[PDB]
């Protein structure tokens, strides 16, 4: 249908991975999706791979598990042959190089011999790239084949495992066993060969180095060896700084979560500037830990660049000095220098290898423990209606037996009832028949199919139709009858989508009663012979249970001639059921029918009784720091190329009398240039890392100001999760990732340019081969960077359903084995694992594709460089050819970094633009103009007047308020009342200028507020919200976050508020640590705290929103009693629902529509027979 092209591709195609080239070029043109993705190979599929492991595990287990990993041994054994060949081919370049340098020096030689070496060099290097990436393919395949197998085995085991063994581990730990431990065996499969390969590679590297120079070459090996423990110590110190940074980050995010949630109250109080300073105080504590991390990193990039110099200097300095007769030739100097770069890789990768093999041995032990658990005995219950003979059941393999001496038989097509007190083993009885408990003695058998309904209902996250169907073919007539009979139609109609929706696990939440009603229906629809109902009756009402019991479970219901054993706490439905079974602490006390069992008077009777974005980042770091870093960078790369060119002159000088003439003079200058290089490496490393902290500080302070200057409309239209993700994800990218990447990218780019400059400086004919190879490099990079990111994205989104599915399986183990649908859920899991590998297999081949193309362009640069030297022998000297070829031989490595760090850059720079997202968005009015600033005239009277005022909720919508004209004198207590969805709430938003006046004017004390600054208005008037939220921190801070006025003022305010009793003589008097939106304090306390805030400011115009909405009628009286005496001469404009508060005022205004319908005195409007009289009647109190 859509097979993998690998199997139907030629030999040459498979060697060079040409068969994926089709999928790469396609991936640039259009986006790659899950459908545009090949079928797996037959030998990679779960149903082929998994059964071979579980077979060998069953075989090996019998004899009594690295012995079981001789399943993937045969395929992986081929790996050793390719890798062994690669290690010997690796030490061909330096051996051939020595001959080529001798050739150029030996003038009187046959010329053709040159061309032979340069040919033999290219061929040798090109067989190396092919054999290498064959070795890596069969390693990455064998690792992929282990992941598929391990996941498979773990899943099968999780079904057959016993309750005792499952209670040992957590649901998390078993899901982590499939997610972490199995994932590590993909990785282990790769680098496990380096345990034998790297030491063999080191041993050879040392020996070739020894023949080339002498015992002097130890001095070089010493340095590189001493860098390994320095790398270890510094890599430990960064991890402790990373954890210190991460702990400080969560404090900032937790505070932002409160600000983003509770902006609505924060804006009304004018606490934007106060909480801006509060976040910045935490941010500076976080930027000091990054500043310590910056100095460290600088030393990290310092040691990397100056190592290949320090080694070279130390080795030559020792060699040259110890004896004057030691002559330094080009054939000695550049071959040893090349060998040192071959020797450098294994020592560095050896600490990572050994580190990872240790962690794999932790994961290997965890699997061995889980796989070698005791499974349930399947032939404990016969499966030839239900009969038991002296059965005894434990929960654990050895434990006090739960059920002891039970002997009961149930006729076919009868209703049985299990009753008793809590902890009588009535819950365990149904678990025993399903073969979950371990049998000790006795005979048990159940006839035909079995349907189960657990106490704690399990509901897998799928379509609610397909949940009740549970993998059965639909029958519309019957499906309608059971859904009706279960009384699920009243619940079905309420749900947003209706018939087909999502589950509370990950979607719309269902109540305890609804969960049972689905779970009951799921069993009913299946239509099995025997039914085991483990207390379905946990519904909202008995009236619901009456409908269900009679229509489904009872003799008049669906299951008329079907065996149905039930266990229940209810005593209501007993006289309907045929026979009742009473238990006593894990033993059947007495069996009998309702009529006869009461007559005996037994236990039963007692039971009933974009370049733009890069320039934005450039302006963020600062232009002085930017230019200084670029200057110090070019100073390093120049100082590097000159030192390597100076080495190539030191080689070329005659031997006068078995001595190299001037050598100490040259050795010094060579030493000096290295210090000049090393100093500038630490320079741009520190300069860039310092710059990253300046941008981090700027972009955070810029973003945090932009958010707070926004209107509340922004916070309604924008999702809260979108804003929280910004501060969390995108800042962390700018802080850590971007500064480290830009120095690795630039470092790589100028090492590639640097290598080309030497090749051109050596051979000017090199020019002609630069545009052809550059054009190839551009196109192979163009397709990879595009296509690769799509495949990695598809892999990361296709791995999440595998863990999501296994977590659901682990919860509903009892149900899956009751209905006996394991085979279904196996195929369900095999399908999901395959869909993950279908994404992962192209992803890994994409890497092999690029690597063969890049290394082929690498081998072309070393070919042409070495060839043009032979074409111009008689011009050049032995030193220039050494330097030219030795550089070109390192190009391949830089091209890999240049392509990677190009892709890493393009993803990370997106985050910079998204931190400046809300820069040009609509901002509210200026916080203070402080030109026409209000004086102390506002409180003198407190006049309020609306002049034909009107507002809209949305920008383009019908008017909410309209024709609002009324005058309020100073000291008057005014009431505002209406019906639901009138717009009385909107008048509070207008008074505080949350939404700017859509049409008309609003005046306070002969001074128009529409022109005046927001914060000057916001302070001068106070508000009591509906649900006053408390911000986490001090209670002293919660009352006054500025802390301007005295502490006695805070006490005398809490004294008048009558909250004196609370936090009176607690050790936390004033500085009590509140948290979680004021969870510590109760509902009533919150109203008194916000009243105290108003009693501290003592403003002459107050407003109350839902003051008497779901109050305990204790703080309700305290609110009203304080309002009377404290705010006696002060104006108040109250928004209330209940009439009791509204009735006790001088003036009241009534509006149902957008217009003011009625206004006057409460006593006057009752006599006038207005809308107030109608409202008062409808309320109840007249």
């Amino acid at each position: 249908p859509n097979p993998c092209p690998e199997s139907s591709a030629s030999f040459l195609s498979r060697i060079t991975f040409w068969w994926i080239t089709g999928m790469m070029v396609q991936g640039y043109r259009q986006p790659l999706e899950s459908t545009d993705l090949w079928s797996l190979n037959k030998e990679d599929t779960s149903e082929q791979v998994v059964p071979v492991l579980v077979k060998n595990w069953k075989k090996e287990c019998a004899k009594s598990f690295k012995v079981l990993y001789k399943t993937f041994g045969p395929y992986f054994l081929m790996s050793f042959l390719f890798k062994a060949v690669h290690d010997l081919m690796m030490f061909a370049g330096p051996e051939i190089l020595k001959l080529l340098i001798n050739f150029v020096n030996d003038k009187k030689a046959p010329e053709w011999q040159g061309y032979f070496y340069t040919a033999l060099l290219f061929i040798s290097a090109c067989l190396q790239t092919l054999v290498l990436h064959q070795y890596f393919h069969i390693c990455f395949v064998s690792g992929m084949r282990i992941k598929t197998a391990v996941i498979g085995a773990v899943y099968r085991k999780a079904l057959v495992i016993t309750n005792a063994a499952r209670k040992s581990s957590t649901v998390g730990e078993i899901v982590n066993l499939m997610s972490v431990d199995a994932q590590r065996f993909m990785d282990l499969a790769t680098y496990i060969n380096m345990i034998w390969s790297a030491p063999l590679q080191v041993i050879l590297a040392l020996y070739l180095l020894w023949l080339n120079l002498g015992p002097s070459v130890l001095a070089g090996v010493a340095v590189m060896v001493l860098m390994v423990p320095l790398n270890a110590v510094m890599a430990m110190k960064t991890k402790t700084y990373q954890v210190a940074h991460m702990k400080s980050k969560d404090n900032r995010i937790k505070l932002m979560n409160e600000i983003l949630n509770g902006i609505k109250v924060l804006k009304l109080y004018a606490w934007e500037l106060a909480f801006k300073d509060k976040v910045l105080a935490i941010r500076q504590e976080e930027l000091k830990v990054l500043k310590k991390s910056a100095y460290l990193a600088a030393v990290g990039t310092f040691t990397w660049v100056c190592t290949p110099f320090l080694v070279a200097l130390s080795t030559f300095a020792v060699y040259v000095t110890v004896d004057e007769n030691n002559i330094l030739d080009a054939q000695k100097a550049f071959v040893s220098l090349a060998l040192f770069n071959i020797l450098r890789f294994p020592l560095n990768i050896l600490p990572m290898v050994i580190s990872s093999i240790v962690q794999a041995s932790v994961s290997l032990k965890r699997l061995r423990v889980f796989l070698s658990h005791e499974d349930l005995d399947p032939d404990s219950i016969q499966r030839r209606s239900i009969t038991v003979k002296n059965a005894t059941f434990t929960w654990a393999r050895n434990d006090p037996p739960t059920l002891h001496g039970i002997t009961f038989s149930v006729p076919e097509g009868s209703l049985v009832a299990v009753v008793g007190q809590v902890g009588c083993g009535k819950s365990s009885l149904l678990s025993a028949l399903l073969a979950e408990m371990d049998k000790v003695e006795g005979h048990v058998t159940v006839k035909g199919s079995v349907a189960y309904v657990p106490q704690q209902a399990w509901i897998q996250n799928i379509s609610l139709r397909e949940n009740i169907l549970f993998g059965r073919q639909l029958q519309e007539r019957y499906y309608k009858a059971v859904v009706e009979a279960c009384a699920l139609l009243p619940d079905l109609e309420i749900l947003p989508s209706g018939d087909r929706t999502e589950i509370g696990e990950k979607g719309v939440n269902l109540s305890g009663g609804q969960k049972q009603r689905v779970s009951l229906a799921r069993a009913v629809y299946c239509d099995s012979d025997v039914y085991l109902l483990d207390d379905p009756l946990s519904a909202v009402d008995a009236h619901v249970g009456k409908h269900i019991f009679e229509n489904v479970i009872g003799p008049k219901g669906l299951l008329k001639n079907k065996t149905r054993l039930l266990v229940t706490h209810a005593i209501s439905y007993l006289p309907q059921m045929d026979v009742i079974i009473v238990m006593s602490g894990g033993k059947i006390s007495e069996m009998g029918s309702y009529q006869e069992l009461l007559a005996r008077d037994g236990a039963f009777a007692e039971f009933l009784r974009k370049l733009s974005v890069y320039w934005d980042y450039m302006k963020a770091i600062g232009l002085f720091i930017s230019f200084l870093s670029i200057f110090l960078f070019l100073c390093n790369h120049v100082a590097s190329l000159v030192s390597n060119y100076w080495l190539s002159l030191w080689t070329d000088d005659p031997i006068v009398n078995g001595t190299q003439e001037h050598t100490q003079v040259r050795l010094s200058v060579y030493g000096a240039l290295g210090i000049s290089q090393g100093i500038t490496v630490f320079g741009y490393s520190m300069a860039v890392s310092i710059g990253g902290i300046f941008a981090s500080r700027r972009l955070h302070l810029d973003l945090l100001h932009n958010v707070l200057r926004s209107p509340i409309s922004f916070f309604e239209r924008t999702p809260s999760g979108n804003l929280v993700n910004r501060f969390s994800k995108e800042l962390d990218t700018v802080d850590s990732m971007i500064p480290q990447v830009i120095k690795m990218f630039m470092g790589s780019l100028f090492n590639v340019i640097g290598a080309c400059i030497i090749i051109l400086l050596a051979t000017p004919m090199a020019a002609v081969i630069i545009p052809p190879l550059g054009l190839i490099y551009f196109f192979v990079q163009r397709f990879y960077v595009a296509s690769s990111r799509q495949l990695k994205r598809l892999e990361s989104v296709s791995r999440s359903p595998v863990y999501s599915h296994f977590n659901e399986t682990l919860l509903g183990v009892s149900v899956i084995r009751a209905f006996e649908e394991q085979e279904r859920f196996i195929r369900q899991s095999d399908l999901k694992v395959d869909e993950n590998q279908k994404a992962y297999y192209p992803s890994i081949v994409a890497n092999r594709w690029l690597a063969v193309r890049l290394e082929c362009v690498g081998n072309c640069i070393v070919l042409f460089a070495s060839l043009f030297a032979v074409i111009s022998r008689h011009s050049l000297s032995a030193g220039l050819v050494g330097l030219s070829v030795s550089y070109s031989l390192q190009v391949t490595t830089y091209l890999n970094w240049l392509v990677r760090m190009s892709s890493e850059m393009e993803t990370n720079i997106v985050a910079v633009e998204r931190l400046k997202e809300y820069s040009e968005t609509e901002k509210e009015a200026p916080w203070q103009i402080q030109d026409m600033a209000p004086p102390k005239d506002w409180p003198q009277v407190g006049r309020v007047e609306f002049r034909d005022y009107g507002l809209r909720y949305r920008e383009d919508l019908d008017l909410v308020l309209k024709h609002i004209n009324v005058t309020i004198d100073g000291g008057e207590k005014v009431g505002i009342v209406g019906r639901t969805g009138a717009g009385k709430s909107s008048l509070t938003l207008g008074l505080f200028r949350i939404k700017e006046s859509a049409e008309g004017e609003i005046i306070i004390d002969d001074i128009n507020i529409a022109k005046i600054g927001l914060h000057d208005l916001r302070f001068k008037i106070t508000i009591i919200p509906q649900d006053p939220v408390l911000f986490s921190g001090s209670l002293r801070m919660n009352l006054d976050p500025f802390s301007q006025y005295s502490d006695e003022e805070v006490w005398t305010s809490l004294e008048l508020a009558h909250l004196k009793g609370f936090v009176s003589a607690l050790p936390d008097k004033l500085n009590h640590e509140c948290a979680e939106g004021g969870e510590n304090l109760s509902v009533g306390q919150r109203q008194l705290v916000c009243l105290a805030r108003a009693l501290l400011r003592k403003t002459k115009i107050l407003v109350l929103d839902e003051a008497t909405a779901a109050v305990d009628l204790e703080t309700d009286d305290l609110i009203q009693s304080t309002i009377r005496t404290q705010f006696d001469d002060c104006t108040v404009l109250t928004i209330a629902h209940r009439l009791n508060t509204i009735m006790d005022y001088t003036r009241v205004i009534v509006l149902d529509k957008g217009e003011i319908q009625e206004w006057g005195s409460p006593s006057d409007l009752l006599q006038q027979r207005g809308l107030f009289y109608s409202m008062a009647k409808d309320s109840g109190l007249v």
């Binding site: 290498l132 890596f136 790769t190 790398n231 990290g300 560095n348 990872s356």
Partner: peptide
């Protein structure tokens, strides 16, 4: 993505390089 290592690793040392 290691400390003082701009060595190219074709290996996946526990991925998340």
């Amino acid at each position: 993505x290691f400390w003082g290592n701009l060595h190219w690793y074709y290996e996946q040392f526990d991925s998340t390089c």
